[PDB]
């Protein structure tokens, strides 16, 4: 088992995740099995506490784990399926060790950070690196990405663990890549290597020695800066890799392959890649990165979102839209519309922003209501679903656009003008959405539907069955708690709201599709968790093909 | 509230505990209320897992907590009663924070070491420093002793916490004392200040600045070494305190008062001691420290102990014996006798060590069987209790010498030759000791008798009632699980084994005293937890007064 | 004597010189006597070895010292006269100590870096801080600017010296200001305080504690960044000073006075400024900084310079031009014309750049030939002087434009077509410029005319006498070696080349002024060494007033 550790230098927002993912993509293209581990030095255990407006985009693995979005980035770039243990945190390690000590399996000894916490870290890393992530074959390389910057208090147990680890796994199996900031004060316009010198000094002091240096700057750095860095950091000048700000993120593995990273890793980790097939063709990645700078025709999509700030709060959604638009060969223009600026309460307060938001929503080609874990701004979501329903505008709803869609449908098409949720307003005669928790053996009470579940379609006349390649079932990822009530599902089925897919027991409803409309569908699950750069997801594919009037042509 | 933080320098075994305790003793003598906090950077939560041969001498507070022996040292030197929270560890802090995060009282934020763990440490320290330890009056100074050496990974959260803390409590209320090693290579016989320079550099880097430097050497250091240290560490030359190896530990507060520490603390922390009464007489401490170097007549006591190694494995016991001997005005010579080297199995293996151990046990004036948390070597304890019973040699048993004494009494005086425990050999018709756990409301099951409990004596003719000042009750500290069976307690009461004291409900037995013997008593509790330098404990007092034939004279 | 030390943080080009000069300007305006010391950690002793294309603009003090240009910046901003010892370097200190040791005035002891080099540094600093720089009154504050970044090997003796020094001069007389880089990666657009945290940690470790933090960013930083910095660096949030990129350098003292630096220094150094007169009016500095952003009408000046690169290679010249243009109330547009691109050798090689350079020289309003210490490109200087002479374009020559002007005058007006220098081509019958070195008692041989010398004018009809306020003499600064030959000075005086000023002995010639021309003058000295922001120098004043046809109007 070979390891590649990716550490960070001067500051935090220095670009470690894209470097690690690109390493993975290169090695994958060369024919290797690659897993990856992300280490977060914060005290949390999961993302089930994280507020959406505070961190954004809980990513859900197919075993039901709510983890960092960085594991989502690895899943997209490497095309693998990671588990909950592929994400180590400080809280997880300290909890495992404190519990082990409290049930007396250290045999009365004093448990200390060194060596017990570092032994725990090393055993965890060695353990989850042999777990298969692509089928059943063992991985051959593991990319470990360490969060934070060297010198911080929070990351010291981990660098101590990895010093000992580099000697435990026989250094010919261990490579370290250091990502640092080469700043450039515009008072003189010269790249400064002094912060990199300091950070590599701290790294050497802690016991680790870099094999690659990845510099982060805005344009390329010359050979003099490269030679100064290789002199102070003890690498070769070819092992100093410059990654400037490129067009897209899909150009970073190509820029890494242009700097000859594959040959250095093939000799340093003693892999035995046969460097003959075009040097392990990254051919379709080249096609995709070329399309990213070629598309011209625009498609405008609206995103009715509560936390309009985009500190990665709709990351998987935006990326599913991008992967869909690139395969449709069109440029994506994304509009973010606050959902609370759509209710006429703002009209009562000040009509200016109300009107401009409504005009931005009106001049769009398609609508996407994402799933906010909450009820704040749901009124705007109902208004937007209604507007799109009575204007023949294509719409896709995600885990809450289903609830909002069925609510507005009942309200303004079946006369149940008091239909609402039990999310809020739990005092309602017409509870259109109810709470049907999961009851699996091993539960006392009930919890969400979490993870990969099977879904079976109903009948013939539906487009979602076509976009999915006409299969009988489809496995997707669920993170919901509330459903719709079957009384009403057969009430509002005579009126135009067909239910196309649901579980094997037919007790819940997952995909609605109101007929007599170009594209009006909704899903309880999240389709943006299985969207990859080289294979988009069929719901977003259809939403893009409909918003530019290419859907029917694509069906045939 | 004023604080004094005591940190450590070059190595670990540098003498921090005695420095902190002596600070406390000085300030106490000057008329102040002093509490103290001990910080252990290890991952454990309590000492209930610690093996006795691994750390030695679990100390039991009077609320039932099993803590470090350093809290025992503070209790002896300061004459206070500390609680479980006066002993912070890394495990306690990380467990409190992980639990707070897992029940969502950080409100969805990311919990990080800085600032959340350091905020937790600061709030804990501020909290337990206002808890009264002497009656009900609030403390005025708090001595915080930080374990480990500056620069270690385990102690970084704590020094970060205390940097922020020094600014939160208004520096005129915060003083730091740094204890360092001044080594002396005998190749040249000159004290070296260079390691102190390095450690104070690391301390300054982490954000703290010393107010006192306490050097640790074998003989005094001159004024040139003192001036070099004050030059590199930014203190005055009078704030460099030399503590060499003295006669006893009772000379350290006197040596601190000779270096004018009280005046510096009175001006630096702005206490308002009225330095007139002999400068706050340490008079009876002077008497005790003088007696330590004056006593001449010897008394030899045997300690039948399993783990003959004395890495502080019988600390409170040995110190109770010392406090008893000093008030009796005699020198104490302590013999450690392995309990497993008394059973004739070693006689079968090799009789040499068997015979020499038995001769050491035979030429002693008194026997003390301590309480080992286990059953290893109990056979030797039975043999020793029997030998002392049939030779009129004074004996005191502690929490297991009671069980061993009653076992040998039954065996070799009432014919129940198969009497044993349920500790080991749970298959016995004659279970002399049984398991009567505590059942207090708030329990599901049963746990030990732990902490301070009341004890009432039975009748008139007993010496233990006399040594205790003839009170009706006495509060002591229990850490036992097994008792004796009442059937047998009234069986072997006609034969000479009187039961003098027990609980209020008379369902257990605590003090046995077999009459027709100079001094043969036993106790279920531990009397060595309430033994102080200036007031010994009556059981050990009587054991010393009997082993030198001064008991009857002392009674009158 | 009060001290202010200015140190540097993360990188080198962080802006220390302007911060130190602005401190000086503020304190000067408040009515204090201020001196300043610059510490360069390089091994050189003077700038007499520095190549002009390598460092640029040797500045000449009025005692004959060739020093850094930073002393020129202090002289301009503070309006003082510094000496050679106001510029400490590593070479100076180590040479003084090595020589002291080699002549046995350490009395046989071992001389070590600590304490002997640091004692030398401290005595030097204490010594030159009491030397008067403005008349004869003792200074009251001293600004010490330490070059380089904390953590470098070259600057460790100096920070050790200043730790000891802060305690030697009684901390109430010592203040430290730390200038650091707050970088801003545009991937997220958030200012990062982590490098400042690291550098202040190193600074604290070395023994110094900041009193002010001066952050360097492109736009202002908020109160959250300010609070994070004050938390980690132990200052108040008002002592965190943000200096963004402003219009000019004359806005930095005003931005410092807006952040209340004067009040903090008045309380911290216990100066006794009476903060009543507008809080010590920086009134004419306000006028000048306002004019910097108000001037509209343009004036274009050409600079025929060898090393067209401007790494501060014509700093004093460009600044004299700016100070002149601002008082004339016009905007200055400066053109840099390579002197070697004017000889027709480039015409033979490629005429494109030749022609474009000649067109840039042709479309200018005035010409300035600066003094290059050499002979490279002098041919272009002769061509430019000739072009300006036969086109009635105003010209000013500086220490080599005098030689070039007299050479072209002889050549193309008196028929001596082989007139040249002994600088190059030492084989010439018509040596128009000769070498007349200085012979002062205390010399074996000859050296340059270096430092402040007196100059007496000749007669009535001249404009340079008018621009100087019609004085009899003027003290200027000389750094030349070659002069003109008196035979020829009376040869080409009938032809239109009048000599207006020279020494007291009339053996050399300093100011030529060819009549029958708007403004054609030349000077052997450098007038750009006495040019101040609030009083320009008369030669450049006249050159600007002539290039915009305002000279004659200004004369009356
Ligand atoms: N394979 C990846 C990796 C990165 N990202 C996105 O690109 C942005 C920048 O990535 P990253 O390198 O992780 O930036 P930072 O997290 O700010 O830098 P660091 O990890 O060093 O803290 C992130 O929002 C991430 O969602 C992505 O699209 N796909
Ligand atoms: N470990 C080091 C490295 C360099 N220097 C000093 O730093 C100075 C160079 O300044 P700087 O430009 O900041 O260093 P660079 O190596 O050039 O780094 P940068 O890329 O930021 O320019 C030199 O005088 C050198 O003596 C030092 O003292 N200690
Ligand atoms: N008030 C005190 C403090 C110390 N001791 C005893 O003296 C010995 C040495 O004390 P200490 O200073 O704590 O030594 P170390 O623990 O080895 O040093 P450190 O705390 O720095 O690790 C210990 O066994 C302790 O039991 C004591 O009798 N009474
Ligand atoms: N921060 C310091 C302190 C001292 N020195 C050097 O260390 C040498 C002194 O050696 P040493 O005896 O080890 O230092 P001392 O201060 O005397 O420490 P010690 O008490 O161990 O003798 C001197 O040459 C001095 O230049 C140094 O380089 N850096
Ligand atoms: N009072 C001053 C100070 C600075 N300068 C000029 O402004 C430029 C930047 O000044 P400085 O702060 O010294 O920049 P650096 O030298 O690059 O930064 P540092 O001193 O920290 O190395 C320099 O070219 C200098 O000539 C100026 O005009 N007048
Ligand atoms: N001395 C310190 C300071 C901070 N942290 C950790 O650093 C993380 C914060 O990351 P970063 O953003 O890089 O630190 P900031 O203080 O916010 O610095 P910056 O201004 O660059 O954002 C937190 O988890 C905190 O636990 C640490 O380990 N050691
Ligand atoms: Mg990242
Ligand atoms: Mg440099
Ligand atoms: Mg100790
Ligand atoms: Mg020495
Ligand atoms: Mg500078
Ligand atoms: Mg941050």
Short mmCIF file of N, CA and C and ligand atoms in Angstrom, two decimals, chain A residues 182-183 190-195 197 201 225 228-229 231-232, chain C residues 10-13 41-43 148-149 151-156, ligand 2:
data_model
loop_
_atom_site.label_atom_id
_atom_site.label_comp_id
_atom_site.label_asym_id
_atom_site.label_seq_id
_atom_site.Cartn_x
_atom_site.Cartn_y
_atom_site.Cartn_z
N UNK A 182 2.71 31.37 -2.47
CA UNK A 182 3.77 32.28 -2.91
C UNK A 182 3.15 33.64 -3.15
N UNK A 183 3.14 34.53 -2.16
CA UNK A 183 2.43 35.80 -2.31
C UNK A 183 3.16 36.73 -3.25
N UNK A 190 6.80 41.01 -7.42
CA UNK A 190 7.78 39.94 -7.38
C UNK A 190 7.26 38.85 -6.46
N UNK A 191 7.32 37.58 -6.86
CA UNK A 191 6.84 36.50 -5.98
C UNK A 191 7.81 36.26 -4.84
N UNK A 192 7.27 36.12 -3.64
CA UNK A 192 8.06 35.98 -2.43
C UNK A 192 8.01 34.54 -1.95
N UNK A 193 9.18 33.93 -1.76
CA UNK A 193 9.29 32.56 -1.29
C UNK A 193 9.54 32.45 0.20
N UNK A 194 9.57 33.55 0.93
CA UNK A 194 9.95 33.53 2.33
C UNK A 194 8.92 32.83 3.23
N UNK A 195 7.61 33.04 3.03
CA UNK A 195 6.65 32.25 3.82
C UNK A 195 6.74 30.76 3.58
N UNK A 197 9.52 29.21 2.86
CA UNK A 197 10.71 28.82 3.60
C UNK A 197 10.37 28.58 5.07
N UNK A 201 10.34 24.95 7.04
CA UNK A 201 11.16 24.80 8.24
C UNK A 201 10.37 24.19 9.39
N UNK A 225 12.55 31.68 -9.10
CA UNK A 225 11.75 31.38 -7.92
C UNK A 225 11.75 29.88 -7.65
N UNK A 228 15.11 28.92 -6.13
CA UNK A 228 15.20 29.32 -4.73
C UNK A 228 14.39 28.39 -3.83
N UNK A 229 13.19 28.01 -4.26
CA UNK A 229 12.38 27.10 -3.46
C UNK A 229 13.04 25.73 -3.37
N UNK A 231 16.12 25.09 -3.51
CA UNK A 231 17.31 25.20 -2.68
C UNK A 231 16.95 25.19 -1.20
N UNK A 232 15.92 25.92 -0.80
CA UNK A 232 15.60 25.97 0.62
C UNK A 232 14.77 24.79 1.10
N UNK C 10 6.16 39.38 7.69
CA UNK C 10 6.06 38.13 6.95
C UNK C 10 7.04 38.09 5.79
N UNK C 11 7.13 39.18 5.03
CA UNK C 11 7.97 39.27 3.86
C UNK C 11 8.83 40.53 3.99
N UNK C 12 9.60 40.81 2.94
CA UNK C 12 10.53 41.93 2.98
C UNK C 12 9.91 43.21 2.42
N UNK C 13 9.40 43.18 1.20
CA UNK C 13 8.85 44.39 0.62
C UNK C 13 7.51 44.79 1.22
N UNK C 41 21.08 44.78 7.48
CA UNK C 41 21.84 43.59 7.91
C UNK C 41 22.76 43.02 6.85
N UNK C 42 23.10 43.78 5.81
CA UNK C 42 24.01 43.25 4.81
C UNK C 42 25.46 43.55 5.19
N UNK C 43 26.39 42.88 4.50
CA UNK C 43 27.78 42.90 4.94
C UNK C 43 28.52 44.13 4.45
N UNK C 148 15.03 43.88 7.03
CA UNK C 148 14.81 42.45 7.01
C UNK C 148 13.59 42.03 7.80
N UNK C 149 13.35 40.73 7.79
CA UNK C 149 12.19 40.13 8.43
C UNK C 149 12.62 39.27 9.61
N UNK C 151 13.20 36.41 12.09
CA UNK C 151 13.42 35.01 11.82
C UNK C 151 14.58 34.73 10.90
N UNK C 152 15.02 35.73 10.14
CA UNK C 152 16.20 35.60 9.31
C UNK C 152 17.46 35.46 10.16
N UNK C 153 18.46 34.78 9.61
CA UNK C 153 19.73 34.59 10.29
C UNK C 153 20.49 35.90 10.43
N UNK C 154 20.35 36.80 9.45
CA UNK C 154 21.18 37.99 9.41
C UNK C 154 20.82 38.99 10.49
N UNK C 155 19.58 38.98 10.96
CA UNK C 155 19.10 39.97 11.90
C UNK C 155 19.02 39.53 13.34
N UNK C 156 19.52 38.36 13.69
CA UNK C 156 19.45 37.84 15.05
C UNK C 156 20.32 38.60 16.04
N1 LIG D 2 17.40 31.64 6.23
C1 LIG D 2 17.71 32.85 5.78
C2 LIG D 2 17.57 33.17 4.44
C3 LIG D 2 17.93 34.43 3.99
N2 LIG D 2 18.47 35.32 4.87
C4 LIG D 2 18.71 36.71 4.50
O1 LIG D 2 17.58 37.26 3.89
C5 LIG D 2 17.98 38.25 2.98
C6 LIG D 2 17.15 38.15 1.72
O2 LIG D 2 15.94 38.82 1.94
P1 LIG D 2 14.61 38.21 1.31
O3 LIG D 2 14.44 38.83 -0.04
O4 LIG D 2 13.45 38.46 2.20
O5 LIG D 2 14.94 36.65 1.20
P2 LIG D 2 14.64 35.79 -0.10
O6 LIG D 2 15.37 34.49 0.05
O7 LIG D 2 15.06 36.51 -1.35
O8 LIG D 2 13.07 35.50 -0.05
P3 LIG D 2 12.00 36.20 -1.01
O9 LIG D 2 11.56 35.22 -2.04
O10 LIG D 2 10.85 36.62 -0.16
O11 LIG D 2 12.55 37.41 -1.70
C7 LIG D 2 19.44 38.02 2.66
O12 LIG D 2 20.18 39.12 3.11
C8 LIG D 2 19.84 36.83 3.49
O13 LIG D 2 21.04 37.14 4.14
C9 LIG D 2 18.57 35.01 6.19
O14 LIG D 2 19.02 35.84 6.96
N3 LIG D 2 18.17 33.79 6.66
#
